[PDB]
Design a protein around this ligand. Structure first.
Ligand code: 3PE
Ligand code: 3PE
Ligand code: 3PE
Ligand code: 3PE
Ligand code: 3PE
Ligand code: 3PE
Ligand code: 3PE
Ligand code: PLC
Ligand code: PLC
Ligand code: PLC
Ligand code: PLC
Ligand code: PLC
Ligand code: PLC
Lengths: 90, 61, 132, 158, 75, 77, 69, 205, 491
C-alpha cells in the first residue's frame, strides 16, 4: 500500500541506534520531497491563472506568484547530512 | 521487396509494444492497478528490508 | 602577393624528419593533374609537420590584402559610424519629443501591473496621468 | 551427427585435385566435440580446412545466441521500466500530500468530495490537462496551508 | 560440517585439475589422482576447522579481559 | 588482409612524427612561456573567480526591489 | 547514362536515380500506410488536445489568489 | 573575508607565544661545515694512501675510483651542507619554528650553491632543475613530519585519550574543535560556518 | 543471492572453458574439434555466459524498491557485505550489458587465442560489476585494482603496434595513483576500526584530516576519470588496446571514478567536499576546454575518440560535485549515455575502418559516404549524439550537468556551456571529413557494414535515444538514492 513517513528527528535519538538514525535520515528526506510536491502544485496554479487571466495576470495571479517566488529557494531537496552533522543551537 | 526483413522489424516492435501497453492498462482495470508484470513477483517493503539492514549494521559494530 | 597563414614556423627541428618550406596547398594551381585531385596532392609528397594547417581541410586563407590592411579598413569603417553617432550626441542634434510621453490613469495602472499596495506603487506603476 | 562414412567421401574427393587454392549436408552435434575418438576429430578438421580452402559475412555463429538470449533480455528490461509497479519518491510524495490534505480537512464536505472522485491514475495529472476533473478545491486547499512536517523535525534553532 | 569439508575436497579437486594443466595431460588422466587430492585437502580442511574453532574460543576469553581493561581506561 | 589501403610513405612518416612529438620537445624559454600560461596563469585566473564569488550569488528566485521606468520626463532644451 | 555502381550500393534513399520495377505497387502500399495513420494522428490529436484557457473558471482562480495570500 | 581553502597538514605540536628560544644559526652551521670538511678532506688523504699502497691491483683501484671526490666536490660539499644548516636554522628562527616552505627554500638554495661549485661545466638551467628537485624532496620530508610524527601519531593520541576508543555520542556537542585524530557524530553549526563560510547552501542559499 | 550467484556461476564458466580447450595440450598434436572456425564453440559458450550475467541482475531488479531509503539485497559473502541502491543498480546493468558487446565486437578480428580473450572479458565485466555492490572501502579498493591484472595482459597480448607502451601506462598510472587512495582507506580503518559505508558516513573528522583524506582519494579518482593533468595514459591506452578492451575502458572503467565520488567522498567527507568544489570545478573546466582544443590537432582516429571521452567525463565530474539533485542526476545520466555512445564511436572508428584498412591515420579517409552509406548514417547519427544533440541521452545528461553547475556556482559554472560548442567543433570536424569530398584515393572499395556490426551499432544507439526521450526510466530509480548525497543546512 502507501507507506508513510516515520516522523523521527535527529534531536530525539541516539545515533548509536542503527535503526533509529536510519529513520531520522529517511524522515527528513520524505518531508523535503513533500515540499517539492507542494511547490509543483503551487506552480500549477500559477500556470493556469496566467493562461486564463490573459492581460489580467499581473493582478489576478499576484499572490500566487509571490508565494512561488518565496517557496522556491527552500522547497528543494537539501539532504539529511547537513542537519544530521550540524547542531544549529551551538 | 518493401516487406523485407529490415523494414518490417521496426513496425513489428511498434505494434507489439502498443499491444502490450494496451494489455497492461486493461490488467490495471481488473487488478486494482497492479501491472501485467505482477506475476514475476512483487517489491520488497521497508519492514522486511529493515531487518536485513538492522542485522547488517549490528555485525559491523 | 600570396602570403602564408599565421602561426606557421619558419624553421623546425624534429630529428631526421625532412625539413621543407611550408606550402599552403590551398593555393596550388587547380588546372594541373594530381594523384589526389581534390586535395591537389601527388602520391608520396612529404608533409609539413603542420600540414593540417596548410591543406584543403584547414580554414580558407583569404589573402587579397594583408591582415593589417583588412584590420585597418575594418576599424576605419566602424570608426565613421561612431564619429557620426558622437557628433549628433554631443551636439544634441536629435529631435525633442513632440508630446509628453504616454501616461495612464489608476496611478499609472499600478494595480494592473502587479503592485500590491501603496508602498509598491512607483515600483510597478507606469507613467502616472496627473490630470485625473 | 559425425557420420564417419560421409567424411571419407569428402576427404577422398579433395584428393582428386592435387593442386590447392588454384557439403551443405554436413552438421555436428554437441555430444560430438567431447566423445569422438582422436582419429575421427583429426579427419573432420582436415576436411574443414580443405573444404574452406576450396572457397559473405553471414552464418558467423552468433546470430542465434543474440536473438534468443540478448534481444529478449533487452525486451525484458524494456518491460520492467514500463510495466513494473514501482513508486518513486516523487510519486510517493504526491500521494502522501493528497492523503494529508484529507486528514487535515475531514470536516470538509467539498474537498473530500473531490478527493474521492479524483481517481488514482490522475493523481500525477493534477492541474490543467485533457482529463476533465475537478481539483479546483484541492488546489485551493494546498495553496492555503502547508501540509509538510519538516518544521517538526528541526527542534534546534539558532 | 559436511558443507565445509565438501568445499575443501572441491579445493583439492581444483588443485589436481590445475596440476594436470601444468603437466599437459588430459584432465581424465589417472582419475584416482582427484580422489587422492580430494582426501588430502579434506584432511587439511578438518584440521583447519579445528584450528579456527579453537581460535574463536581463545579470542572470546581474551576479549573479556580486554573489555575489562578498556572499561578502566574509559574513566 | 588484401591491403585495401594504398599505404603512403609520406603519410606514415608524418603520422609517426605526430605521435612522437614528445621526443623532440625542449623545455626552452618558448616552452616555459606556454607552460606558465596554460598551467599557472589561466588556472589562477579561474582560481580567483571561483573563490571570490563562492556563496556570493544568491540568484534563486531573486526579486526586483527597484523601479525600471522613469516617472517624469525632462526636455533637453 | 553514367555508371552509378548500383550492384552493391543500395542505400535506404536509393543511390543515383533508383526507381524499382515494382514502384507502382509499393507506392500504393505506402500511400495507404501514410493515409491510415495520418487519420490516427487526427484521432489522437482530437482526443488529447484541450483549451488551456477554459480549464478553470475565473471564479475558481479568485479563490486561489486569496487562499494563497 | 579570507578564502576558505583546505588545509592538508599533518598534526604538529605548536609552541606557545613567547616560547621557542631560537637556535644559533652561525654556530650550528659552523659545526656542520667544519666537521664535514675535516672528514671529507681527511678521508681524501686516507684514500690517497690506499692509492700509493697499491695501484697495480684493478680491484682496489675500481673501488677507490667510486669513492673518489674531485677537488671542487671536496670544497663544494662542506659549503652546501654548511649553507643548508645555516639557512635551515635561520629560516626556522624567522618563522618561530620549522616549516616545509622554509626547508624547501633552504635545501634548494644550498643545493644551487653547491651545484654551482662542483657542477660548473653544466648549463645554469640544469643546476636550477636539480636544485628545485632537491629542495622539493626536503620540503616533502618536513611536510610528512620528518621520520615520524612522534607525539602527534594516532597511537600517541590513542594513549592520551584523544583518539576514538570510547566511541561516539551525538548528544555530546563540544564548543572547542575536535582533535586531529578524533571523530564525532554531530558538530556545532558555528564550526561549519567557520570552515566553509555562508553561501551556497550553508545557512543561506 | 546476487553476488553469490554472480561469482559462483562465472567461476564454473571460467573452469568449463579451461577444461574443454586445454584437455589436448599434451603433445597430442591433434586437430581437435573445438578449434574449428576460430574456436566457435568456445566463443559461443563465453557469449552465452555474458548474457546469463545480465539475467542474474534482472532477477534482483524485479524486487527492487525505488521508494526505499538504504541499501537493498544486503548479503554476506566471502566475509564481505554486498548491497545495492538506485545508483548502483543502473551501473551494474550498464556494466553487464556491455559484456556481450565486447565479445561480439572481437568476434572475428583476433589473431588467435579466443578462449583467453573471452575469459578475460567476462572476468573484467564481473570484477567491475562487483565494484558497484560492495559496501566497504577495502572491498571497493580490492575490486578497483583487481581489474589491472587481466587488463594489463589483455592489452599486451591482443594490442596494436605500441601495445607495450600502452600496457605499461595503464598498469603504472592506475596502480600508483590508487595506492594513494589506499593510504586514505588505511587511515579510515585505523581511526574508526571499520571501512563500512554506513559506519563511516556518520563520522565527522577534523577539517585538517578531511583535507588529507580527500587528497589521497581524489588522486586515485582524478587519474581514472581521467582529469587534467594526469590524463596522458588514456589516449595511448585506447589507441593500442583491442576493440573489446576499448569498449570496457570507455564504457565502465571510467565510470568507476564517478561512483568513487558517490561512495568515497560525498557521504563521508561532506564538509571538505564543499571546500574542494571550486578546485574541482577549475580542474574539470580546464580539462573540458583543453581536451577539446587538443582534439582538433589529433591525427589518429582512435585517439580523437579517446580525447572526446575526456571532455565529457569532465562534465560528469562537474555535475556530481554540484550539491543539488539536478546536477547529480545529470551526471549519472551522462555516465550511462556516454556508456553507449563512446563504445559505439570506437566500433565505427576502431572496429569497422580498422578491420578493413588497418590504418588509423586521418589523412587516408574521406568521402566514405559514396561506397559506405550505411557506415555514414551511423557515423553521422552517433556524432550528433556525441555532441549532445537533443533526443539523445547525452544532451539530457549534459544539460542537467551544466544546469547543476550553474545552480552550484553561477559565475564559474557557466563556463561548462562551452561543452556545447567545443564538442561539436572537433566531432563534426572529423565527421565532416570522413563523409566529405570524393571517395579517398588511398582506399579500395570493399564491403559495407556487416550484420554483426549493424547489430552492435543498433543496440548501442537504442538505449541512448530511449533515455534521451524518456529519462524518467532512469531518474525514477535514481531519485531517492541521489537525494542522500546533498549536504546543506539552510536556516
Ligand atoms: C569562442 C571563440 C571561437 C572558438 C574557435 C575555436 C577554434 C576553431 C574551431 C573550428 C576549427 C575549424 C574547422 O573546423 O574547419 C574549418 C572551417 C571551415 O570554414 P571556412 O573554410 O571558412 O568555409 C569556407 C567554405 N567554402 O571553419 C569553420 O567553419 C569553423 C566555424 C567557426 C567555429 C566557431 C567560431 C565562433 C566564433 C564566434 C565569434 C566570432 C566573432 C564575433
Ligand atoms: C618536483 C621536482 C621538480 C623538478 C623539475 C625538473 C625540471 C626539468 O627536469 O627540466 C628538464 C631539464 C632537461 O632540459 P630540457 O627539457 O631538454 O630543455 C632544456 C633546453 N635548454 O632537466 C634537467 O635540466 C636535468 C636535471 C633534472 C633534475 C631532476 C630532479 C629529479 C629529482 C626530484 C624528483 C621529484
Ligand atoms: C521503432 C519503434 C520503437 C517501438 C518502441 C516504442 C514504443 C512507443 C511507446 C508505446 C506507447 C503506446 C501508446 O501509443 O499509447 C497510446 C497513448 C494513449 O495514452 P493516453 O494517456 O490516453 O494519451 C495521453 C496524451 N495526452 O496515446 C498517445 O498519447 C500517443 C500519441 C503521441 C503522438 C506523438 C506523435 C509522434 C510522432 C509520431 C510519428 C509516427 C506515427 C505515425 C505512424 C505512421 C503514419 C504514416
Ligand atoms: C683534537 C681533535 C679531535 C677530533 C676528533 C674527531 C675526528 C675528526 C672527525 C671530524 C669530526 C666529525 C665527528 C665529530 C663527532 C661525531 C659527531 C658528534 O658527535 O657531534 C659532535 C659535533 C658537535 O656537536 P655537539 O652538539 O657539540 O655534540 C652534542 C653535545 N650535546 O657535531 C658535529 O657537528 C660534527 C660534524 C658532523 C657533520 C658532518 C658529517 C656529515 C657529512 C659527512 C658525512 C660522512 C660520510 C657519511 C657517513 C654515513 C654513511 C652512511
Ligand atoms: C634556488 C632558489 C629558488 C627558490 C628557492 C625557494 C623560494 C621559495 C620561498 O619560499 O622563498 C622563501 C625564502 C625563505 O623561506 P621562508 O622560511 O618562508 O622565510 C621566512 C618567512 N617569514 O626566501 C628566500 O630567500 C628564497
Ligand atoms: C560443494 C560444497 C561447496 C562448499 C559449501 C560452502 O559452505 O562453501 C562456503 C561458501 C558458502 O557460503 P556460506 O559460508 O554458507 O555463507 C556466505 C559467506 N561466504 O562458499 C564459498 O565460500 C565459495 C567461495 C569460492 C568462490 C569464490 C572464490 C574467489 C572468487 C574471486 C574473488 C571475487 C571477489 C574479488
Ligand atoms: C562558448 C561560450 C559559452 C559561454 C561561456 C561562458 C560565458 C559565461 C561566463 C560569465 C558567467 C555568467 C555571467 C553572470 C554574472 C552576472 C550576474 C549579475 O547579476 O551580475 C551582478 C552579480 C551580483 O549582483 P548585484 O546585486 O548587482 O551585486 C551587488 C550585490 N550587493 O554579480 C556581480 O557582481 C558580477 C560578478 C562578476 C562577473 C564576472 C564576469 C566575467 C567572467 C569572465 C570569465 C573568464 C573570461
Ligand atoms: C582451474 C581452476 C581456476 C580457479 C578456480 C577456483 C575454484 C575455487 C574452489 C574453492 C572451493 C571452495 O568452495 O572452498 C570452500 C571451503 C569451505 O569453506 P568453509 O570451511 O565453510 O569456510 C567458510 C568460507 N567463508 C569464510 C568465505 C565463509 O574452503 C576452502 O576450501 C578454502 C579454499 C582454500 C584457499 C586457500 C587458503 C586456505 C589455506 C590456509 C593456508 C595459509
Ligand atoms: C588422509 C588424507 C590423505 C590421503 C592420501 C594422501 C597420500 C596419497 C598417496 C597415494 C599414492 C600416489 O600418490 O600415487 C601416485 C599418484 C599418480 O601419480 P601420477 O602423476 O598420475 O603418475 C602416473 C602414475 N601411473 C603411471 C601409474 C599412471 O599420484 C597422485 O595421485 C598424486 C596426488 C597426491 C595428493 C597429495 C595431497 C597433498 C595434500 C597437502 C595438504 C597440505
Ligand atoms: C590544470 C592545473 C590546475 C591546478 C589547480 C587549479 C586550482 C587553483 C586554486 C587557486 C586558489 C586561489 O587562488 O586561492 C587564493 C589563495 C589565497 O588568496 P589570498 O589573496 O592570499 O587570500 C584571499 C583573501 N582576499 C581575497 C581577501 C585577498 O592563494 C593560495 O594560498 C593558493 C595556494 C595554492 C596555490 C599556490
Ligand atoms: C599535493 C599535496 C600537497 C599539500 C600542500 C602543502 O603541503 O603545501 C605545500 C607545503 C606548505 O607547507 P608549509 O608552508 O610548511 O605550511 C603551511 C603553513 N602552516 C604552517 C600554517 C600550515 O610545502 C611543501 O612544498 C610541502 C610539499 C608537500 C608534498 C605532498 C605530496 C602529496 C602527498 C599525498 C598525501 C595523501
Ligand atoms: C573471478 C576470479 C577468477 C580467478 C581465476 C583466474 C583464471 C585461472 C586460469 C588458469 C587456467 C589457465 O591458465 O588456463 C588458460 C586459459 C585459457 O587459455 P587458452 O586460450 O585455452 O590457452 C591456449 C591453449 N591452446 C593453444 C590449446 C588454444 O587462460 C585463462 O583462463 C586466462 C585467465 C587469466 C588471465 C588474467 C590473469 C590475472 C592474474 C591475477 C588475477 C587477479
Ligand atoms: C529527426 C530525425 C530524422 C530521422 C529520419 C530522417 C531521414 C533519414 C534518412 C536516411 C537515409 C540517408 O539519408 O542515408 C543514406 C544516404 C545515401 O545517399 P543517397 O541519397 O541514397 O545517394 C547515394 C549515393 N552516395 C552513395 C554517393 C551517397 O545518405 C548518405 O549515406 C549520405 C551521407 C550522410 C548520412 C546522412 C544521415 C542522416 C541522419 C540524420 C541524423 C539526425
Amino acid at each position: 500500500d502507501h507507506v508513510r513517513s516515520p516522523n523521527v528527528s535527529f534531536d530525539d535519538i541516539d545515533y548509536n541506534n542503527s535503526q533509529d538514525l536510519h529513520n531520522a535520515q529517511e524522515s527528513l528526506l520524505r518531508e523535503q520531497w513533500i515540499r517539492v510536491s507542494a511547490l509543483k502544485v503551487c506552480r500549477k496554479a500559477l500556470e493556469s491563472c496566467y493562461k486564463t487571466s490573459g492581460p489580467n495576470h499581473y493582478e489576478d495571479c499576484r499572490e500566487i506568484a509571490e508565494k512561488y517566488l518565496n517557496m522556491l529557494p527552500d522547497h528543494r531537496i537539501q539532504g539529511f547530512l547537513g542537519y544530521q552533522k550540524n547542531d544549529p543551537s551551538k | 521487396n518493401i516487406f523485407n526483413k529490415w523494414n518490417v522489424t521496426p513496425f513489428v516492435w511498434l505494434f507489439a509494444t502498443v499491444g502490450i501497453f494496451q494489455w497492461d492498462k486493461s490488467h490495471r482495470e481488473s487488478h486494482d492497478g497492479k501491472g501485467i508484470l505482477d506475476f514475476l513477483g512483487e517489491i520488497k517493503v521497508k519492514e522486511s528490508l529493515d531487518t536485513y539492514f538492522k542485522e547488517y549494521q549490528t555485525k559491523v559494530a | 602577393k600570396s602570403f602564408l597563414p599565421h602561426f606557421i614556423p619558419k624553421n623546425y627541428s624534429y630529428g631526421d624528419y625532412p625539413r621543407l618550406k611550408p606550402e599552403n596547398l590551398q593555393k596550388r594551381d587547380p588546372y594541373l593533374k594530381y594523384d589526389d585531385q581534390a586535395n591537389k596532392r601527388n602520391f608520396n609528397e612529404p608533409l609539413h609537420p603542420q600540414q593540417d594547417d596548410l591543406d584543403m581541410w584547414a580554414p580558407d586563407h583569404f589573402d587579397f590584402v594583408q591582415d593589417s590592411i583588412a584590420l585597418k579598413w575594418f576599424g576605419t569603417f566602424f570608426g565613421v559610424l561612431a564619429v557620426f553617432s558622437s557628433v549628433i550626441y554631443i551636439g544634441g542634434l536629435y529631435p525633442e519629443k513632440p508630446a509628453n510621453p504616454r501616461n495612464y490613469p489608476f496611478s499609472g495602472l499600478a494595480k494592473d501591473l502587479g503592485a500590491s499596495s501603496e508602498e509598491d506603487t512607483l515600483l510597478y506603476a507606469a507613467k502616472i496621468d496627473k490630470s485625473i | 551427427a559425425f557420420n564417419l562414412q560421409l567424411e571419407k567421401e569428402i576427404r577422398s574427393k579433395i584428393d582428386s585435385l592435387p593442386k590447392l587454392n588454384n557439403v551443405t549436408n554436413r552438421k555436428l552435434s554437441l555430444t560430438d566435440y567431447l566423445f569422438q575418438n582422436a582419429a575421427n576429430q583429426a579427419l573432420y578438421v582436415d576436411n574443414e580446412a580443405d573444404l574452406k580452402e576450396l572457397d559473405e559475412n553471414e552464418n558467423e555463429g552468433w546470430e542465434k545466441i543474440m536473438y534468443v538470449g540478448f534481444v529478449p533480455t533487452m525486451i525484458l528490461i524494456f518491460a520492467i521500466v514500463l510495466f513494473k509497479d514501482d513508486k518513486s519518491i516523487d510519486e510517493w510524495a504526491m500521494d502522501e500530500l493528497l492523503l494529508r490534505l484529507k486528514e487535515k480537512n475531514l470536516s470538509d464536505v467539498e474537498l473530500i468530495d473531490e478527493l474521492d472522485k479524483l481517481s488514482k491514475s490522475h493523481v500525477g495529472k493534477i492541474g490543467a490537462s485533457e482529463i476533465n476533473k475537478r481539483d479546483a478545491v484541492i488546489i485551493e486547499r494546498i495553496l492555503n496551508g502547508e501540509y509538510d512536517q519538516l518544521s517538526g523535525l528541526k527542534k534546534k534553532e539558532l | 560440517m559436511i558443507a565445509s569439508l565438501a568445499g575443501w575436497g572441491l579445493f583439492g579437486v581444483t588443485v589436481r585439475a590445475y596440476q594436470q594443466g601444468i603437466r599437459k595431460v588430459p584432465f581424465s588422466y589417472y582419475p584416482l589422482g582427484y580422489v587422492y587430492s580430494a582426501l588430502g585437502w579434506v584432511a587439511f580442511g578438518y584440521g583447519f576447522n579445528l584450528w579456527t574453532e579453537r581460535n574463536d574460543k581463545l579470542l572470546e576469553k581474551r576479549v573479556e579481559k580486554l573489555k575489562e581493561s578498556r572499561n578502566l581506561r574509559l574513566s | 588482409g588484401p591491403h585495401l589501403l594504398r599505404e603512403d610513405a609520406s603519410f606514415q612518416r608524418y603520422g609517426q612524427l605526430r605521435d612522437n612529438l614528445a621526443t623532440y620537445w625542449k623545455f626552452n624559454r618558448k616552452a616555459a612561456r606556454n607552460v606558465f600560461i596554460f598551467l599557472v596563469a589561466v588556472p589562477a585566473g579561474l582560481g580567483y573567480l571561483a573563490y571570490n564569488y563562492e556563496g556570493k550569488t544568491p540568484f534563486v528566485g531573486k526579486r526586483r526591489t527597484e523601479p525600471i521606468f522613469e516617472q517624469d520626463y525632462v526636455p533637453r532644451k | 547514362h553514367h555508371i552509378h555502381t548500383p550492384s552493391y550500393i543500395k542505400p535506404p534513399t536509393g543511390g543515383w536515380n533508383f526507381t524499382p520495377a515494382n514502384w507502382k505497387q509499393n507506392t500504393v502500399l505506402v500511400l495507404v500506410g501514410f493515409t491510415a495513420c495520418c487519420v490516427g494522428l487526427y484521432k489522437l490529436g482530437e482526443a488529447g488536445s484541450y483549451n488551456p484557457k477554459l480549464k478553470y473558471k475565473e471564479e475558481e482562480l479568485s479563490r486561489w489568489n486569496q487562499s494563497a495570500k | 573575508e579570507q578564502f576558505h581553502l583546505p588545509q592538508p597538514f599533518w598534526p604538529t605540536t605548536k609552541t606557545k607565544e613567547g616560547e621557542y628560544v631560537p637556535k644559533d644559526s652561525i654556530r650550528e652551521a659552523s659545526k656542520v661545515f667544519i666537521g664535514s670538511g675535516v672528514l671529507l678532506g681527511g678521508m681524501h688523504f686516507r684514500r690517497l694512501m690506499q692509492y700509493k699502497k697499491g695501484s697495480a691491483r684493478p680491484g682496489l683501484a675500481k673501488y677507490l675510483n667510486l669513492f673518489s671526490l674531485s677537488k671542487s666536490q671536496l670544497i663544494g660539499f662542506p659549503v652546501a651542507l654548511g649553507a643548508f644548516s645555516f639557512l635551515s636554522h635561520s629560516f626556522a628562527n624567522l618563522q618561530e619554528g620549522q616549516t616545509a616552505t622554509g626547508e624547501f627554500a633552504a635545501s634548494s638554495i644550498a643545493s644551487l650553491i653547491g651545484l654551482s661549485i662542483f657542477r660548473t661545466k653544466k648549463p645554469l638551467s640544469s643546476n636550477v632543475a636539480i636544485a628545485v628537485g632537491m629542495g622539493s624532496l626536503f620540503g616533502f620530508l618536513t611536510w610528512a613530519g620528518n621520520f615520524n610524527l612522534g607525539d602527534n601519531s594516532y597511537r600517541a593520541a590513542l594513549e592520551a585519550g584523544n583518539g576514538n576508543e570510547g566511541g561516539f555520542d551525538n548528544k555530546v556537542i563540544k564548543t572547542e574543535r575536535q582533535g586531529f585524530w578524533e571523530g564525532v557524530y554531530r558538530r556545532p553549526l558555528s564550526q561549519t560556518v567557520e570552515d566553509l563560510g555562508e553561501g551556497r547552501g550553508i545557512i543561506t542559499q | 543471492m546476487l553476488v553469490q550467484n554472480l561469482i559462483i556461476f562465472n567461476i564454473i564458466g571460467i573452469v568449463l572453458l579451461v577444461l574443454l580447450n586445454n584437455n589436448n595440450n599434451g603433445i597430442l598434436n591433434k586437430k581437435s574439434l573445438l578449434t574449428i572456425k576460430n574456436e566457435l564453440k568456445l566463443k559461443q559458450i563465453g557469449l552465452i555466459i555474458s548474457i546469463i550475467n545480465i539475467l542474474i541482475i534482472i532477477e534482483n531488479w524485479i524486487g527492487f524498491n525505488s521508494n526505499y531509503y538504504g541499501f537493498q539485497n544486503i548479503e554476506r559473502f566471502l566475509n564481505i557485505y554486498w548491497g545495492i541502491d538506485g545508483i548502483s543498480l543502473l551501473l551494474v546493468l550498464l556494466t553487464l550489458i556491455l559484456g556481450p558487446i565486447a565479445i561480439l565486437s572481437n568476434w572475428k578480428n583476433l589473431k588467435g587465442y579466443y578462449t583467453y580473450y573471452v575469459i578475460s572479458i567476462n572476468m573484467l565485466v564481473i570484477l567491475m560489476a562487483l565494484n558497484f555492490i560492495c559496501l566497504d572501502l577495502v572491498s571497493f579498493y580490492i575490486l578497483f585494482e583487481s581489474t589491472l591484472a587481466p587488463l594489463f595482459l589483455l592489452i599486451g597480448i591482443y594490442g596494436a603496434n605500441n601495445k607495450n607502451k600502452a600496457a605499461y601506462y595503464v598498469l603504472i598510472y592506475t596502480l600508483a595513483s590508487s595506492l594513494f587512495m589506499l593510504l586514505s582507506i588505511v587511515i579510515y580503518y585505523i581511526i574508526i576500526n571499520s571501512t563500512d559505508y554506513i559506519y563511516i558516513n556518520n563520522i565527522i573528522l577534523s577539517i585538517n584530516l578531511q583535507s588529507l583524506l580527500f587528497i589521497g582519494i581524489i588522486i586515485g579518482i582524478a587519474v581514472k576519470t581521467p582529469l587534467m593533468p594526469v590524463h596522458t595514459w588514456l589516449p595511448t591506452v585506447h589507441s593500442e588496446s583491442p576493440l573489446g578492451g576499448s569498449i570496457l575502458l570507455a564504457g565502465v572503467i571510467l565510470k568507476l571514478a564517478i561512483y568513487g565520488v558517490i561512495r568515497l567522498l560525498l557521504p563521508n567527507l561532506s564538509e571538505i567536499s564543499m571546500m574542494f568544489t571550486p578546485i574541482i570545478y577549475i580542474i574539470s573546466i580546464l580539462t573540458l576546454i583543453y581536451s577539446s582544443l587538443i582534439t582538433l590537432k589529433q591525427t589518429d582516429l582512435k585517439v580523437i575518440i579517446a580525447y572526446s571521452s575526456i571532455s565529457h567525463l569532465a562534465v560528469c565530474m562537474i555535475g556530481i560535485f554540484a550539491n543539488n539533485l539536478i546536477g547529480i542526476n545529470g551526471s549519472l545520466i551522462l555516465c550511462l549515455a556516454h556508456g553507449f555512445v563512446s563504445p559505439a564511436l570506437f566500433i565505427l572508428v576502431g572496429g569497422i575502418l580498422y578491420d578493413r584498412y588497418h590504418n588509423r591515420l586521418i589523412n587516408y579517409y574521406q568521402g566514405l559516404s559514396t561506397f559506405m552509406p550505411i557506415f555514414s548514417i551511423y557515423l553521422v547519427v552517433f556524432s550528433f549524439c556525441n555532441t549532445g544533440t537533443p533526443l539523445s541521452g547525452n544532451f539530457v545528461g549534459e544539460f542537467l550537468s551544466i544546469t547543476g553547475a550553474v545552480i552550484r556556482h553561477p559565475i564559474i559554472g557557466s563556463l561548462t556551456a562551452a561543452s556545447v560548442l567545443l564538442s561539436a567543433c572537433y566531432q563534426m570536424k572529423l565527421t565532416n571529413r570522413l563523409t566529405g569530398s570524393v571517395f579517398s584515393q588511398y582506399l579500395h572499395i570493399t564491403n559495407d557494414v556487416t550484420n554483426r556490426e549493424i547489430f552492435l551499432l543498433n543496440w548501442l544507439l537504442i538505449p541512448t535515444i530511449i533515455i534521451g526521450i524518456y529519462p524518467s526510466f532512469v531518474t525514477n530509480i535514481l531519485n531517492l538514492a541521489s537525494s542522500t548525497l546533498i549536504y546543506s543546512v539552510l536556516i
